[PDB]
Amino acid sequence: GLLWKIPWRMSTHQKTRQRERLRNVDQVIKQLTLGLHVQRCQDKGLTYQEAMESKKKYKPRSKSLRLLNKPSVFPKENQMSSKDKYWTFDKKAVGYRKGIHKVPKWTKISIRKAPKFF
Amino acid sequence: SQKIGHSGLAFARLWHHVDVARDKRTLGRLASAIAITLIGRHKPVYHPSQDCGDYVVVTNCQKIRVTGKKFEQKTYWSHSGRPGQLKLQTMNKVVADKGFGEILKKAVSGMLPKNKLRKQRLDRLKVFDGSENPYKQNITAFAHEQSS
Amino acid sequence: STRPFLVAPSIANSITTEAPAINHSPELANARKWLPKRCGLITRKKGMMPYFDKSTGERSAATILEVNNVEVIMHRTSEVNGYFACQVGYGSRHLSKVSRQMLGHFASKVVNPKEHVAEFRVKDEKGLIPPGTLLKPSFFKEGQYVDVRSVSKGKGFTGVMKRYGFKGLRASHGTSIMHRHGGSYGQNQDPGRVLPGRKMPGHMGNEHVTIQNVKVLKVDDENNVIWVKGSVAGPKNSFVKIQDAIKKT
Amino acid sequence: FKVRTSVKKFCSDCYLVRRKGRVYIYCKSNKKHKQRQG
Amino acid sequence: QVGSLPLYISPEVQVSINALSMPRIIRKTSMNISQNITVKGPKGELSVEVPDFLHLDKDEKINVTVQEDKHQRSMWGTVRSLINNHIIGVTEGHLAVLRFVGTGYRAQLEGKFVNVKVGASIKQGLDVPEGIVVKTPAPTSLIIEGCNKQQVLLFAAKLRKFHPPEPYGKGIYVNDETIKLKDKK
RNA sequence: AAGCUAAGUUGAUAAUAAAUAAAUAUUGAAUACAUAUUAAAUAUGAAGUUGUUUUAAUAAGAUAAUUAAUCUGAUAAUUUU
RNA sequence: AGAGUAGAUAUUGUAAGCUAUGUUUGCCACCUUCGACUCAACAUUUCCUCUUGGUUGUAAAAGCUAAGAAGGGUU
RNA sequence: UAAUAUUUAAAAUCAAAUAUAUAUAUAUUUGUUAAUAGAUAAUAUACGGAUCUUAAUAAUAAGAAUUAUUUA
RNA sequence: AGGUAAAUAAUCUAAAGGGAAACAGCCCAGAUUAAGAUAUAAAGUUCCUAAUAAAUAAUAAGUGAAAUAAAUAUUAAAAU
Ligand SMILES: [Mg+2]
Ligand SMILES: [Mg+2]
Ligand SMILES: [Mg+2]
Ligand SMILES: [Mg+2]
Ligand SMILES: [Mg+2]
Ligand SMILES: [Mg+2]
Ligand SMILES: [Mg+2]
Ligand SMILES: [Mg+2]
Ligand SMILES: [Mg+2]
Ligand SMILES: [Mg+2]
Ligand SMILES: [Mg+2]
Ligand SMILES: [Mg+2]
């Protein structure tokens, strides 16, 4: 019909970009957590520097942040597998897999955890 | 300021020489390299609205390096306007007919920018299967290089 | 007494190498070609008449080729010209008709201002004949076969029916105003043009024709004529060339 | 020959050989068991 | 395996190793042929061109060993075999017998041209290559002798191509080829 | 009668050669056997390919001429090959 | 699976499997003429001619089946 | 160590890494084949094209422009 | 089915710019007017064509190199 010339693989450059994006997302989360921790420290009664130093850093309480922190639910880039950085689970593909770059707004969308065996 | 001065030497066409016997670049790479020279992209005075490229003499083109089975299998094409008159010639066949020089030339042509200047640039490139050629005298040569 | 010359190291140290054999070289092409060994001669087609074989009593249409004043002018060699051939002249021509340059050329080669000059290409240096030497019909033997070149009669602008023997259309059964036309000249949009070499009306004749393996029937030095079996192309007084044939050598 | 995409030796006399970018099976006894791949 | 097996050399047989004049190279992994192995003996001599990674070893008896790529391994076995064959040629030279087994099918030497006459309405044959010597005791038997085992056998094959053995079984039989097994009428 | 024409006449259906397709082989390892090589070597093999032959175009090269009482062309006249 | 005087694979090859083509009958609704004559051009999934493998079913001759092959021809 | 019959797996198992008490234990995370054939139609080869697979002897010098995992 | 009917989101409709060879609807990004120094997005960096150097493996088919063709067969490789 109408030619949408989009390849089934990604170029190395694309892959690298994807990786970078993933890393950035992780970093954002990390930063958020750090901020929360330092706020907690300040509330308790410490300085900024002191808070930064502290061995026992506080985990976040809010559900979403906690979930993000868990690597079971939301892996970090170094943890993540090759097969999940550049492919998603498609319920109706051959091999039940599909290049992430096919997913509508893949540059914004985050999607790490494919199914366990698929 | 910088552009002001005697600019005659900049836009002088140098003759370069490449001995394909003594060059280990494979065909395509070599062609690409030559293309740049032809265009004149190597010189800082280049501007796209100007043919300012140098001359390239290729010699010993018989010893050019081609990889894989391309000598046998790589097919050059030519079509008249007339349906059914598609000529498809293998690289080896072409070589037998015209020479390795032709091969090289084709590659260079492909490399070059597709505009008026193209043909001139292509013609600047002078290729010879063996060593001997009529340009031996005019290749650029320095006085300090004369130890040999 | 030396001159200021330099030399690049890249070109000095470059080991000597011979360029291999190009097929599109003249030399190579020469080898390939299927050329005659001997030379030939220029002639004028005079007319046609019947030859009668006196033993079998059989009538053969024969065209008379007149060999007036045929002379080798000069020859061409592989070293200088890249092929082996002799330039033959035919017939005397009046100074007034000949260019100064051409007169000079003729003088160079001690011949009279010729009517028609033509090269005959040969195989090897052996085929050449000494220059300035005259040729007679006796250069050919009765019974031998020759290849003849001449320029066909011009038919002017011709239709497709005459050029290519097209069938035209029906004479009377509705057919209107197109009786001798060529019909379709292509297909629809999927060439969308007329292909090169489409047979179409146009000039016909006045072109070179080589007619091969004609038998020399007779050869009479006393009349300056050769007799050839059959029809030779072109009008009366057309210049013809005969070489010994290659297919039946 | 029997030209086909599946080339399998029938008997112990059949031997598998690969030439000219194709898999052949020649059989020293039964000429019927001569196969070529593609 | 074959390459490692040693090669006994009788006295009167030399196996010399040399370089070449203009070493040729073969690309596609590559293989450069610069070495020469020249075998000499009472019946003749022959030079075999050889890679570079191959090493002859002269004992008081010779060996051959290669510098352990698969290609090298493949070459090694071949080369030893070749030299063995050459050795055999140079002393007890090689020989192949062709038996013509059809009615009126026969062979005849015309000097050293061989004309095989087998049912054809035109006569045909070929000329023996240098180093090959044919003799014909009966007109139905032809014996080809030479120092080069490969060459002689090639020649034999060419001759037998003219009429291979039918399956019901007139033809030309090389050596001990009893390939024709007669189908039942 | 000329000319034009086929229903007439004459001729050609382009060799020799080179490399090949499917196929047929020699020796011969990798793999103690076998294996024509999707190994190194060595061969046969088609109305196909390359080429040749034919026509048209192009014009490298070659021969000669050089400011001219009749240099090379055009215009002009009488014309048909 | 089964035929094939025996034996799936010379030749045949049910129903079910996996594909290719866009030469048929359809479906969709982006978009509003069959033949004859003349001249054919292109393709190869080759009808003939050239080379070849298989053929208890290649004794030969005719065939059958398969590979290469589009040069010439195909009322 | 040869031959032998399956399988193409990190679930289990092993290795490595991160988080919890911590030289161990617990929990999570990651790591397991490649070629060739099969392969195909009609104006023209059709990665957009040139073209790309490397090699001693020698280059103040080329060494994938493919596929997979990465770095700056 | 570039089919049809609805659901959710985006874009197009009404959106120029960069990429996807060319491209309504894809990937990025919303043009007030310039200017062109610095960050860059998606995409790329032998030449055409703005910009590239490395590392480890695999491939020898031009497979492949921005549109992946299936069953199956052959050959190899690992694991038990
Ligand atoms: Mg599109
Ligand atoms: Mg006739
Ligand atoms: Mg076919
Ligand atoms: Mg195409
Ligand atoms: Mg591309
Ligand atoms: Mg719709
Ligand atoms: Mg509207
Ligand atoms: Mg837009
Ligand atoms: Mg909007
Ligand atoms: Mg705005
Ligand atoms: Mg490709
Ligand atoms: Mg593709």
Residue E100: closest CA among E160, E12, E17: E160
Site from C14, C18, C198 to mutate, B interface, most B CB atoms within 10 angstroms: C14
Tell me the chain C residues in contact with residue B145 when contact means C-beta distances shorter than 8 Å. Answer: 6, 8-9
**Contact across the interface for C11 and B139, Cβ inside 8 Å:** yes
For E78, residues 6+ apart whose C-beta sits below 8 A from its C-beta are none
Tell me the chain B residues in contact with residue C24 when contact means C-beta distances shorter than 8 Å. Answer: 97-98
Q: Which residues pair with C244 in a beta bridge?
A: C146
Q: Are E147 and E89 in contact (CB under 8 A)?
A: yes
- As a residue count, chain D comes to 38
Q: C23: Cβ under 7 Å from strand F? A: yes
* Amino acid letter, residue A51: A
Q: A1: Cβ under 7 Å from strand I? A: yes
Give the distance, in angstroms, between residue E2 CA and nucleotide H1 C1'. 21
- What is the Cα–Cα distance from D33 to D26, expressed in whole angstroms? 7
Q: B84: Cβ under 7 Å from strand G? A: yes
- Give the other-Cβ count within 10 Å of C101's Cβ: 8
- What is the Cα–Cα distance from B67 to B72, expressed in whole angstroms? 11
- What is the Cα–Cα distance from D13 to E179, expressed in whole angstroms? 14
For B23, residues 6+ apart whose C-beta sits below 8 A from its C-beta are B30
**Residue A6 CA, ligand 9 centroid: distance in Å:** 24
DSSP structure string for A31-82: HHHHHHHHHHHHHHT--HHHHHH-SSPPPP-SHHHHHHH-TTTS--TTTS-H
Q: Are C44 and C64 in contact (CB under 8 A)?
A: no
- What is the Cα–Cα distance from C200 to C183, expressed in whole angstroms? 10
Neighbours of ion ligand 1 (CB under 5 A): A 3
Interface of C with B in 103-122 (CB under 8 A): none
Q: C-alpha E41: how far from its chain's center?
A: 16
DSSP structure string for D1-38: -EEES-----STTEEEEEETTEEEEEESS-TT--EEE-
- What is the Cα–Cα distance from C74 to E31, expressed in whole angstroms? 56
Q: A21: Cβ under 7 Å from strand I? A: yes
Q: C-alpha B57: how far from its chain's center?
A: 7
> Treating both helix axes as pointing N-terminal to C-terminal, what angle do B27-39 and B100-111 enclose, rounded to 10 degrees?
60
Q: Are E58 and E68 in contact (CB under 8 A)?
A: no
Q: Are C41 and C92 in contact (CB under 8 A)?
A: no
- Give the other-Cβ count within 10 Å of E80's Cβ: 23
Q: B81: Cβ under 7 Å from strand G? A: no
Residue D34: closest CA among D21, D20, D11, E168: D11
- What is the Cα–Cα distance from E92 to B90, expressed in whole angstroms? 48
For nucleotide F16, the protein residue with its alpha carbon nearest to C1' is C34
Q: Phi first, then psi: what are they for A60, rounded to 5°?
A: -85, 150
**What SS3 state is found at E159?**
helix
- What is the Cα–Cα distance from A18 to A25, expressed in whole angstroms? 11
Q: Are B63 and B141 in contact (CB under 8 A)?
A: no
Residue C46: closest CA among C113, C91, C86, C96: C91
Q: Spell out which residues of D between 1 and 38 contact strand I, using CB within 7 Å.
A: 5-8, 16, 18, 23, 37
- As a residue count, chain A comes to 118
- What is the Cα–Cα distance from A39 to A52, expressed in whole angstroms? 11
Residue B105: closest CA among B20, B34, B42: B34
* Resolution given for this structure, in angstroms: 3.2
For B16, residues 6+ apart whose C-beta sits below 8 A from its C-beta are B37, B54, B55, B56, B57, B139, B140
- What is the Cα–Cα distance from B123 to B127, expressed in whole angstroms? 10
Residue C78: closest CA among C31, C24, C21: C31
DSSP state at residue C103? H
**Contact across the interface for C8 and B17, Cβ inside 8 Å:** yes
Largest CA distance in chain C: 96
Q: Are B122 and B110 in contact (CB under 8 A)?
A: no
Q: Are E179 and D27 in contact (CB under 8 A)?
A: no
Q: Which two three-digit tokens encode residue B79?
A: 């079509």
Q: Which residues pair with C249 in a beta bridge?
A: none
Q: Are strands C156-158 and C202-204 parallel, antiparallel or unpaired?
A: antiparallel
Give the angle subtended at the CA of C122 by the CAs of C118 and C126, to the nearest 5°: 120
- What is the Cα–Cα distance from C224 to C226, expressed in whole angstroms? 7
Q: Which two three-digit tokens encode residue C116?
A: 């028609």
Q: Phi first, then psi: what are they for C232, rounded to 5°?
A: -110, 140
**Residue A17 CA, ligand 9 centroid: distance in Å:** 27
Q: Phi first, then psi: what are they for E71, rounded to 5°?
A: -60, -45
Q: Which residues pair with C240 in a beta bridge?
A: C43
- Give the other-Cβ count within 10 Å of C202's Cβ: 11
Q: E113: Cβ under 7 Å from strand G? A: no
Left (φ > 0), alpha (ψ -120 to 50) or beta: where does E34 sit?
alpha
What is the nearest CA distance from C9 to chain B, expressed in angstroms? Answer: 7
- Give the other-Cβ count within 10 Å of C70's Cβ: 22
- How far, CA to CA in Å, does B2 sit from each of B11, B44, B45? 16, 12, 11
> Up-side HSE of residue A1: CA atoms within 13 Å toward CB?
2
Q: Does C12 touch chain B (CB under 8 A)?
A: yes
Residue B127: closest CA among B109, B145, B148, B146: B109
Q: Residue holding tokens 């690298």?
A: A16
Q: Spell out which residues of C between 169 and 198 contact strand F, using CB within 7 Å.
A: none
**Contact across the interface for B142 and C20, Cβ inside 8 Å:** no
- What is the Cα–Cα distance from A113 to C113, expressed in whole angstroms? 100
For A112, residues 6+ apart whose C-beta sits below 8 A from its C-beta are A22, A74, A75, A80, A84
**Contact across the interface for C10 and B82, Cβ inside 8 Å:** no
- What is the Cα–Cα distance from B49 to B40, expressed in whole angstroms? 12
Helix spans in B4-148 (H): 27-39, 70-73, 91-97, 100-111, 117-124
Q: Which residues pair with C187 in a beta bridge?
A: none
**Residue A1 CA, ligand 6 centroid: distance in Å:** 12
Q: Does B109 touch chain C (CB under 8 A)?
A: no
Give buried/exposed letters for A73-97 (b at 16+ CB in 10 A, else e): ebbbbeebeeebbbbbebeeeeeee
For E30, residues 6+ apart whose C-beta sits below 8 A from its C-beta are none
For nucleotide F29, the protein residue with its alpha carbon nearest to C1' is E78
- What is the Cα–Cα distance from E44 to E9, expressed in whole angstroms? 15
Q: D15: Cβ under 7 Å from strand G? A: no
Q: Are strands E172-174 and E94-100 parallel, antiparallel or unpaired?
A: antiparallel
Q: Are E56 and E37 in contact (CB under 8 A)?
A: yes
> Up-side HSE of residue B108: CA atoms within 13 Å toward CB?
29
For C112, residues 6+ apart whose C-beta sits below 8 A from its C-beta are C69, C92, C93, C106
Q: Are C72 and C20 in contact (CB under 8 A)?
A: no
For nucleotide G10, the protein residue with its alpha carbon nearest to C1' is D32
- What is the Cα–Cα distance from B37 to B14, expressed in whole angstroms? 10
Q: Are E84 and E74 in contact (CB under 8 A)?
A: no
- What is the Cα–Cα distance from A39 to A46, expressed in whole angstroms? 10
- As a residue count, chain C comes to 249
DSSP structure string for C121-168: E-STGGG---TT-EE-GGGS-TT-EEEEEEEPPP-EEE-HHHHS----
**Residue in C9, C14, C18 closest to B145 by CB:** C9
Q: Spell out which residues of A between 44 and 83 contact strand I, using CB within 7 Å.
A: none
Q: Which two three-digit tokens encode residue B51?
A: 């043919």
Nearest CA in chain B to C23: B97
For A4, residues 6+ apart whose C-beta sits below 8 A from its C-beta are none
**Residue A2 CA, ligand 6 centroid: distance in Å:** 13
DSSP state at residue B27? H
| Cβ contacts from B onto C, under 8 A | 74
- Burial class from Cβ neighbours inside 10 Å (0-12, 13-18, 19+) for residue E96 reads buried
Q: Are B73 and C189 in contact (CB under 8 A)?
A: no
Residue E13: closest CA among E150, E144, E147, E151: E147
Q: E20: Cβ under 7 Å from strand F? A: no
- Burial class from Cβ neighbours inside 10 Å (0-12, 13-18, 19+) for residue E178 reads exposed
Give buried/exposed letters for B129-138 (b at 16+ CB in 10 A, else e): bbbebeebee
For B36, residues 6+ apart whose C-beta sits below 8 A from its C-beta are B42
